[PDB]
Design a protein around this ligand. Structure first.
Ligand SMILES: Cc1cc2nc3c(=O)[nH]c(=O)nc-3n(C[C@H](O)[C@H](O)[C@H](O)CO)c2cc1C
Ligand SMILES: Cc1cc2nc3c(=O)[nH]c(=O)nc-3n(C[C@H](O)[C@H](O)[C@H](O)CO)c2cc1C
Ligand SMILES: Cc1cc2nc3c(=O)[nH]c(=O)nc-3n(C[C@H](O)[C@H](O)[C@H](O)CO)c2cc1C
Ligand SMILES: Cc1cc2nc3c(=O)[nH]c(=O)nc-3n(C[C@H](O)[C@H](O)[C@H](O)CO)c2cc1C
Ligand SMILES: Cc1cc2nc3c(=O)[nH]c(=O)nc-3n(C[C@H](O)[C@H](O)[C@H](O)CO)c2cc1C
Ligand SMILES: Cc1cc2nc3c(=O)[nH]c(=O)nc-3n(C[C@H](O)[C@H](O)[C@H](O)CO)c2cc1C
Ligand SMILES: Cc1cc2nc3c(=O)[nH]c(=O)nc-3n(C[C@H](O)[C@H](O)[C@H](O)CO)c2cc1C
Ligand SMILES: Cc1cc2nc3c(=O)[nH]c(=O)nc-3n(C[C@H](O)[C@H](O)[C@H](O)CO)c2cc1C
Ligand SMILES: Cc1cc2nc3c(=O)[nH]c(=O)nc-3n(C[C@H](O)[C@H](O)[C@H](O)CO)c2cc1C
Ligand SMILES: Cc1cc2nc3c(=O)[nH]c(=O)nc-3n(C[C@H](O)[C@H](O)[C@H](O)CO)c2cc1C
Ligand SMILES: Cc1cc2nc3c(=O)[nH]c(=O)nc-3n(C[C@H](O)[C@H](O)[C@H](O)CO)c2cc1C
Ligand SMILES: Cc1cc2nc3c(=O)[nH]c(=O)nc-3n(C[C@H](O)[C@H](O)[C@H](O)CO)c2cc1C
Ligand SMILES: [Cl-]
Ligand SMILES: [Cl-]
Ligand SMILES: [Cl-]
Ligand SMILES: [Cl-]
Ligand SMILES: [Mg+2]
Ligand SMILES: [Mg+2]
Ligand SMILES: [Mg+2]
Ligand SMILES: [Mg+2]
Ligand SMILES: [Mg+2]
Ligand SMILES: [Mg+2]
Ligand SMILES: [Mg+2]
Ligand SMILES: [Mg+2]
Ligand SMILES: [Mg+2]
Ligand SMILES: [Mg+2]
Ligand SMILES: [Mg+2]
Ligand SMILES: [Mg+2]
Ligand SMILES: [Mg+2]
Ligand SMILES: [Mg+2]
Ligand SMILES: [Mg+2]
Ligand SMILES: [Mg+2]
Ligand SMILES: [Mg+2]
Ligand SMILES: [Mg+2]
Ligand SMILES: [Mg+2]
Ligand SMILES: [Mg+2]
Ligand SMILES: [Mg+2]
Ligand SMILES: [Mg+2]
Ligand SMILES: [Mg+2]
Ligand SMILES: [Mg+2]
Ligand code: NA
Ligand code: NA
Ligand code: NA
Ligand code: NA
Lengths: 64, 64, 64, 64, 64, 64, 64, 64, 64, 64, 64, 64
């Protein structure tokens, strides 16, 4: 059985590095992370000093 | 990093109050709730005495 | 077996009251109405004196 | 010919009143506003003292 | 309030039995599981000796 | 000209048998049923003793 | 209150004429037909001597 | 950089001629119109003497 | 078994004639073409002297 | 690099067996078939003596 | 009230840099740009000497 | 007439470089590749030593 958690990673450098930020967080607290699906991307501008890239992923992990 | 939980709130008064019912529940058990996205709405009729409005939301919260 | 009819309700007050207007109509002419799913919302402005809220629902009813 | 502008209205009271906030703004600066389609709804929580309801609409107006 | 968890069940026999595999897992660890919505289906071929059917479901459960 | 009716069939055995339950009902009351498109699938759990599979179909029939 | 019926019109000439074929049928049997939304288009080739264009529409009519 | 404007053209003859009606309007007031994407089609019936075909397009133009 | 190929036809006259341009090409090189589904439409303007209508279709053919 | 082919399998028994019919065909003519994604399901009724279940899949295979 | 403009940025280096190209343009001519949502990505190949990455964004800005 | 092939490119560096990996493969075996549309992105984690970025594209090429 797999389960997915819906995480948004952020990076001031790229959409790829924001996806990696969400996956790193998942791997700190979950075992058996097996793949992530991008479901959305965006850029925070007003609320920040530097633009922040956001990549939202479903991060799948195998249960047991 | 943000994470989202997928909650359906209910209200016998309105779609807005059913969204608030899901967000109140999230805020009772999560810190740093930052925003909710509506993803679906519906109305329970058969199973109930009064119509019940349902508003399903992804409730985002900032991790740490 | 359930069947759905695709109805748009209208209200000069709210999206919730326009959903109720479609469901009331379904319950006047159908037995066993069991739930409704919102599929669209909009507001009539040009063609009317007051703004009219519209909420389109699939209204499900149990057949027999 | 119709044209649409993509506006997000906000309200501390309801999704209906946030849709009206976007339409009022359109009517202050456009002639011949004829109807609006809801395309998204959400609630601002972290960044505000009171929850703020948001209703994003395509606001259509007739050109000439 | 309902909450949903996003699970993928697997079966070497059918899409129905893979949906049941995700729901059985949910019922082992959650109380008040009330319904599941299929959101995707697929078949693992390369990585396995027998084809494995996968049925991904949002499994809804009533909170309290 | 074809017309479609939106029916949900149920079965305690499989998604295929729930699609057949909706089509059998259509064929009892409509002439010239020509094909069905699956548009959704789900499983009733809380409200029932046995899980019930549901397969919602647009059932197309040729008019005349 | 509006209701919609889901009809597919056919024409050996164009997608526009197949939409008109579905609307003409609706107007033969319904009062107060007010507008149609195209939801799909396709072309029958194998089963026919001439290609047949198909335009599927939700045909809305005002109830009363 | 391209920008898109969301226009609905109308024609009493065809969906193609309603798309052309939106593009002609864009070309009267914009320089460098480069392509249009159809996003919706429909037919006005109740409000008019003749059926009016509508084709909504994103009309893209190159900025500078 | 059916297979589909994803083709975009073009025409300087109509969306219907651009769909026919993709289907004619499929029938020149495939046997047993049985039907086509429209999946997108657009109009080339900048790159051409006359507007060119484009209709993208999945063209299905029966294998053997 | 993976490539996908879009195949519809058929079965007079189930949606699972129609998915297997498309995958078997892919494996007869392609090397390195690695997984399939269901994208649509339907049932042929008018044109046949027995109902025929159809399951359309993108069948992915690894290139080289 | 927020408004969105639909811009496509281009870059010969990355999807992230094409999103930044659309946002920079928005910030040259709009005040209060607050965030952008990616809605599409693609790559121009035939018409150019170097591949050009394109990232289309809705760029939101706060009105007043 | 254009045709599209559905390819997934992979890269251990970025989503942009995985899109380029699919396009390079298309250009090795097809003439007249003219543009690619991103349709999905994801990251392989479990099955690999380094994360692998995947970008799935429809790669369009002009036929003749
Ligand atoms: C992707 C992205 C989306 C956002 N959406 C909203 C919104 O709907 N309303 C709001 O007040 N702030 C918003 N802030 C947003 C920031 C980012 C970065
Ligand atoms: C929004 C809404 C949806 C529902 N959907 C179903 C359904 O598919 N099948 C069922 O047995 N009961 C259902 N009950 C439902 C109740 C509500 C309120
Ligand atoms: C939600 C909403 C949508 C509408 N859409 C159209 C349209 O496409 N064309 C038209 O002539 N009138 C329209 N009138 C519309 C009115 C409402 C209220
Ligand atoms: C609807 C809604 C959406 C938002 N989305 C985001 C987001 O993606 N990222 C962010 O930093 N802030 C966000 N803020 C948001 C606020 C609202 C109210
Ligand atoms: C449904 C299904 C989907 C999959 N998708 C991918 C994919 O995108 N990339 C990959 O390396 N492996 C994949 N493996 C997949 C296996 C299954 C069973
Ligand atoms: C598919 C499926 C969906 C359902 N959805 C809902 C829902 O939204 N709310 C509710 O009160 N009951 C629900 N009951 C549901 C039962 C089934 C079987
Ligand atoms: C638009 C269009 C779609 C069709 N789809 C199918 C299908 O899925 N399976 C089948 O046996 N015949 C089909 N026949 C089809 C014919 C037309 C015209
Ligand atoms: C495409 C089309 C859509 C329309 N939609 C609506 C609607 O939702 N409500 C309304 O009062 N009038 C409507 N009028 C409409 C007219 C056209 C032509
Ligand atoms: C439908 C249509 C779409 C197109 N899209 C693009 C695009 O995204 N970028 C570009 O450089 N040229 C484009 N050219 C396009 C031309 C047509 C006709
Ligand atoms: C899934 C399914 C879809 C079909 N769709 C169509 C259609 O649009 N028009 C037609 O003439 N025949 C059709 N035949 C169809 C048969 C099947 C089995
Ligand atoms: C993303 C992308 C899309 C495009 N689409 C089209 C199209 O549909 N037709 C055309 O003639 N040229 C096209 N050119 C395109 C170029 C790019 C870069
Ligand atoms: C994007 C991506 C998707 C995948 N999906 C699946 C899946 O559904 N099931 C499975 O067994 N393996 C999977 N492996 C996957 C790997 C990647 C990289
Ligand atoms: Cl989710
Ligand atoms: Cl419907
Ligand atoms: Cl838009
Ligand atoms: Cl495809
Ligand atoms: Mg930096
Ligand atoms: Mg987002
Ligand atoms: Mg009350
Ligand atoms: Mg729901
Ligand atoms: Mg009043
Ligand atoms: Mg509507
Ligand atoms: Mg107040
Ligand atoms: Mg929004
Ligand atoms: Mg076995
Ligand atoms: Mg999946
Ligand atoms: Mg049994
Ligand atoms: Mg359902
Ligand atoms: Mg003729
Ligand atoms: Mg169809
Ligand atoms: Mg005329
Ligand atoms: Mg429209
Ligand atoms: Mg000519
Ligand atoms: Mg296209
Ligand atoms: Mg048999
Ligand atoms: Mg199909
Ligand atoms: Mg360079
Ligand atoms: Mg694009
Ligand atoms: Mg490296
Ligand atoms: Mg994928
Ligand atoms: Na989730
Ligand atoms: Na219907
Ligand atoms: Na717009
Ligand atoms: Na394809």
């Amino acid at each position: 059985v797999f389960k997915k958690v819906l995480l948004t990673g952020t990076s001031e450098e790229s959409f790829t590095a924001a996806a990696d930020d969400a996956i790193d967080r998942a791997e700190d607290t979950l075992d058996n992370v097996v793949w992530a699906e991008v479901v959305d991307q965006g850029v925070e501008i007003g609320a920040v000093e530097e633009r922040t890239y956001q990549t939202e992923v479903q991060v799948a992990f195998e249960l047991d």
